[PDB]
Structures are given as C-alpha cells and as structure tokens.
Amino acid sequence: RLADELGGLWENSRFTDCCLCVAGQEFQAHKAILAARSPVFSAMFEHEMEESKKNRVEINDVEPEVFKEMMCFIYTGKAPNLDKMADDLLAAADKYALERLKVMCEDALCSNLSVENAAEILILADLHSADQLKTQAVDFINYHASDVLETSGWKSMVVSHPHLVAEAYRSLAS
Amino acid sequence: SSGPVAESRCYTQIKVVKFSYMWTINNFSFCREEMGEVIKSSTFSSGANDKLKWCLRVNPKGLDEESKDYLSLYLLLVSCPKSEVRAKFKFSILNAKGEETKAMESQRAYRFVQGKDWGFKKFIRRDFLLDEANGLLPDDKLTLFCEVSVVQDSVNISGQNTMNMVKVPECRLADELGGLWENSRFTDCCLCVAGQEFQAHKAILAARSPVFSAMFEHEMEESKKNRVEINDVEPEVFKEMMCFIYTGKAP
Known part of the structure; x- marks a missing residue:
C-alpha cells in the first residue's frame, strides 16, 4: 500500500506547494519529492527561482500524455503504461536525470527490438x-546486418549519423 | 603417422529434389531401329533449377550381344555447370489401364556429370512388351515414366540468437529517504521531542501517518504551521520510529 500513499498526493493532489505547467495545461506538484528523486530538479528549485518566481514555472519541453506517466512514476514509484509508449518517456527521464526510469525505459525498448527500426533505436x-x-x-545490428541494411532507416542513419556506423564497425571488428 | 577417421563438426542433413518425366513413344511398333541404334528423348529439367538438363534414351533392340532381345533404357545428363550431380532414378512403363508395372529402381544415388548416362541395360524383353495381352501398348504407344531425385547434401544452420538483456533492475529506494535525514536537506516545519530539535517535512508525514495528517490540517495549518511539539515519547526510540516511517525498516 506503499505506492497508493504518495500516489494519494498526486491523484487527489493533497495541497501542493508550486504550480507546474505543460504547454498551457495546469498541473500541481510538490518540491520535496521532485528534488529528492530528480537531481536536475533539485539543482533547479534552489538556484535563482525560490526567491522571486517561486509560484509559477513553465515546463515547455514535454508532451502531457507522457508527463502524466513521469509524474505517476516520481510519486507512486511505478509506471504502468510504460511498455506501450516507452519511446519518449526515455527522453523525458534522461532530460531530468531519472536514472532508474531511464533503465526501465531502456529495458522496455531493448525488448521491443526489431530489424525494421534498429536504426531509429540506435539514433535515440x-x-x-x-x-x-x-x-x-x-x-543486435551486428547479428542482423544481413537484413537491416536494406531498410531506409539505415540509409537515413548513415547519411545523418556517421560516427554510429563507425562505432558499430569498430565493435564488429575482431 | 596415425590418421584415423575425419570428423565433420556439423550434423548431416540433405536436400532431395524429386521430379518426374512422362515420355510417350507414338507408333513404337513402326520405329524400326535395328541393333545398336539409339532413340534419344527431348531435353527435360526439374523446375527448381534449370542448370541440370536431362534426357532419356532408348535402344529399341538392345545394344551388345547380352541384350539381344531387350529394351535398354538410359538416363542422360545433357548439360551441367562443371559440377557433379548425385541423382537417383527409377523407370517404369504405364500400362493401358494406368498402373505402372515394370518399375526398376536404382538402390543408391548415382554420380552424374555432363554427357554421362547411367541406366538399366535389359529393362524389359521385347516379346513380353509386344504380346498385346499385357496391355503395355495402348493404341501402339509406349509410355515411360522416370522419377529422378537429385540429392545435394546441403548445410543449412543458424548461429547465436543472443537474447534480450539485462537483469538487475536495481531498486535503491531506501538511500533516497536516508538522504532526507542524514543530510537533513532543508526541511519546512520544525518538530520537537521534549525540548530537543528535529526537522521534518509535511507531505510524507501526512501521507504515511493519518494522525500526523489530522494534526497538520485541522486548526493548526493557519496559525502554528511551522512549530509543533511532540512531547510524549523519548528521543532514543522516536529516532527509530521516524527512521522507520521514511526508510521502511528499523535497524
């Protein structure tokens, strides 16, 4: 019943302290849990903002459908709808240095590997x-260079990201 | 010095491409080729690969003196791309009704090469064929059915299927809560245990301890929000209770 407490600070919203914002939309959230579980937030909340603009902050870099999952992970300590939409939650977790959520997102993406999109996964x-x-x-690309090479994704990654191709070649060497 | 059996390191698995060819000799009683004269078929192929091209070959009166009154049927490999085939074969004669009768098989796969023709001398006696009671000549035609089967001895195999990783989804939830206590990390409200000073938050207390929630919200949150005195327990065990409520274990 550990997760449902702390989640009760989120769904019921239980008298927060500072107001977030996801592209105009309104969210309410605390400061202790954010600073504790997200180091970038901890460095963010204390330096230059708590004196002047403490009430209002604009988080204008993430989509709300994954903001709900990040902010039901930070509070409840688990992310249910993760394997279906793990592609951008990894970006959100790495932006704010949530290492544990980053590792679960990497596991979820790694378990969804396929030949038709390995270039996209390498780019991300x-x-x-x-x-x-x-x-x-x-x-995975070392094993399945037989058929990933035909895919347009590989040509896009070759034209756009040379050093990944060079690193894959170095790994496959010897 | 020495030299025993040579290992292969791979399991033995083979291919078999078995096809057929039906050949009709119209007016066979009027062909009239004498001793030692052949009648070659039309080139045929398998269908899987057309590199190998085959063609049957009859001698209506058997070659050599041993087969004086026999039908000698041969299978010939017209053209191959400078490689040796290992095909198997069997011939048979379709009767008038439709059931092949004089089937004659090759017990082993014979080695073929371009221009080399394996086959059975003395396939069948001429007199038994022309008897007109066995019914192997419907409307004076001869139907011959050859079932070739090329064996190839391939090596089809797959290697590592390296599985999705990795284990250790490590959970380190206690260190974080320990960090709200040892570093003491800029709290918001001040507790008190019989004069002594402790610093602690409001969210976690209200979440995990209903009595704390009722103290913080009802009649207190307006006036005395910073300071409350918990003046009923000794600190030496209060420290264990309030390092249990957060970290979830009591050493």
Whole structure:
C-alpha cells in the first residue's frame, strides 16, 4: 500500500506547494519529492527561482500524455503504461536525470527490438546518452546486418549519423 | 603417422529434389531401329533449377550381344555447370489401364556429370512388351515414366540468437529517504521531542501517518504551521520510529 500513499498526493493532489505547467495545461506538484528523486530538479528549485518566481514555472519541453506517466512514476514509484509508449518517456527521464526510469525505459525498448527500426533505436540511444541500450542495439545490428541494411532507416542513419556506423564497425571488428 | 577417421563438426542433413518425366513413344511398333541404334528423348529439367538438363534414351533392340532381345533404357545428363550431380532414378512403363508395372529402381544415388548416362541395360524383353495381352501398348504407344531425385547434401544452420538483456533492475529506494535525514536537506516545519530539535517535512508525514495528517490540517495549518511539539515519547526510540516511517525498516 506503499505506492497508493504518495500516489494519494498526486491523484487527489493533497495541497501542493508550486504550480507546474505543460504547454498551457495546469498541473500541481510538490518540491520535496521532485528534488529528492530528480537531481536536475533539485539543482533547479534552489538556484535563482525560490526567491522571486517561486509560484509559477513553465515546463515547455514535454508532451502531457507522457508527463502524466513521469509524474505517476516520481510519486507512486511505478509506471504502468510504460511498455506501450516507452519511446519518449526515455527522453523525458534522461532530460531530468531519472536514472532508474531511464533503465526501465531502456529495458522496455531493448525488448521491443526489431530489424525494421534498429536504426531509429540506435539514433535515440545516441541522442539520449543511453549506454546499455547502445550496447544492446550494437549487438543486435551486428547479428542482423544481413537484413537491416536494406531498410531506409539505415540509409537515413548513415547519411545523418556517421560516427554510429563507425562505432558499430569498430565493435564488429575482431 | 596415425590418421584415423575425419570428423565433420556439423550434423548431416540433405536436400532431395524429386521430379518426374512422362515420355510417350507414338507408333513404337513402326520405329524400326535395328541393333545398336539409339532413340534419344527431348531435353527435360526439374523446375527448381534449370542448370541440370536431362534426357532419356532408348535402344529399341538392345545394344551388345547380352541384350539381344531387350529394351535398354538410359538416363542422360545433357548439360551441367562443371559440377557433379548425385541423382537417383527409377523407370517404369504405364500400362493401358494406368498402373505402372515394370518399375526398376536404382538402390543408391548415382554420380552424374555432363554427357554421362547411367541406366538399366535389359529393362524389359521385347516379346513380353509386344504380346498385346499385357496391355503395355495402348493404341501402339509406349509410355515411360522416370522419377529422378537429385540429392545435394546441403548445410543449412543458424548461429547465436543472443537474447534480450539485462537483469538487475536495481531498486535503491531506501538511500533516497536516508538522504532526507542524514543530510537533513532543508526541511519546512520544525518538530520537537521534549525540548530537543528535529526537522521534518509535511507531505510524507501526512501521507504515511493519518494522525500526523489530522494534526497538520485541522486548526493548526493557519496559525502554528511551522512549530509543533511532540512531547510524549523519548528521543532514543522516536529516532527509530521516524527512521522507520521514511526508510521502511528499523535497524
């Protein structure tokens, strides 16, 4: 019943302290749990904002359908609707340095690997600074370079991201 | 020195491409080729690959003196791409009704090469064929049915299917709550245990302890929100209760 307390601070919203905003939409949330579980938030809340603009902040970088999942992970400590839409939740988690959610998102993406989109997964794993997902994507492309190469995704990644191709070649070497 | 059996390191698995060819000799009683003269068929192929092209070959009166009054039927490999086939074969004669009778098989796969023709000398006696009571000549035609089967001895195999990883979805939920206590991390309201000073939050207390929620919200949140005195327990065990409510374990 651990998760349902703390979740009760979220669905019922239980007298928060500061008001967030996701592209105009209104959300209410605390400061203790954010600073505790998200280091970027902790450095954010204390430095230059708590004195002047403490009430109002604009979070103008994430979509709300995944903001609900990030802010039912930070509070309740588990993310139910993760494997269906794990592609952008990894980006959100890595933006605010939520390492544990990052690792579950990497596991979810790694378990959804396929030949038709391994280039996209490699691009996201390089852009979002993943390591385990990068290694697992490199191994998967090494095994299935027989048929991933025909896909348009590989041509896009070759034209746009040379160093990933070079790193895959270096890994496949020896 | 030494030299025993050579291992293969791979399991033995083979291919078999078995097809057929039906050949009709119209007016066979009027063909009249003498001793030692052949009558070659039309080129036929399998269908899987047309690299190999075959063609049957009859000698209406058997070649050599041993087969003086026999029908000698041969299978010939016209053209192959400089490689040796290992095909099996069997011939048979369709009767008038439709059931092949004089089936004659090759017990093993024979090695074929371009221009090399394996086959059975003395397939059948001429007199038994022309008897006109066995019914192997419907309307004076001869139907011959050859069932080739090329064996190839392939190696089809797959290697590592490296599985999705990794284990250790490590949970470190206690360290975080320990960090609200040891570092003491800028709390919001001040408790008190018999004069002593402790600092603590409001969200976690209200969430996990209903009595705390009722103290913080009813008649207190307006005037005395910062300071409350818990003046009924000794601190040496209060520290264990309030390191249990947060971290979820009492050492």
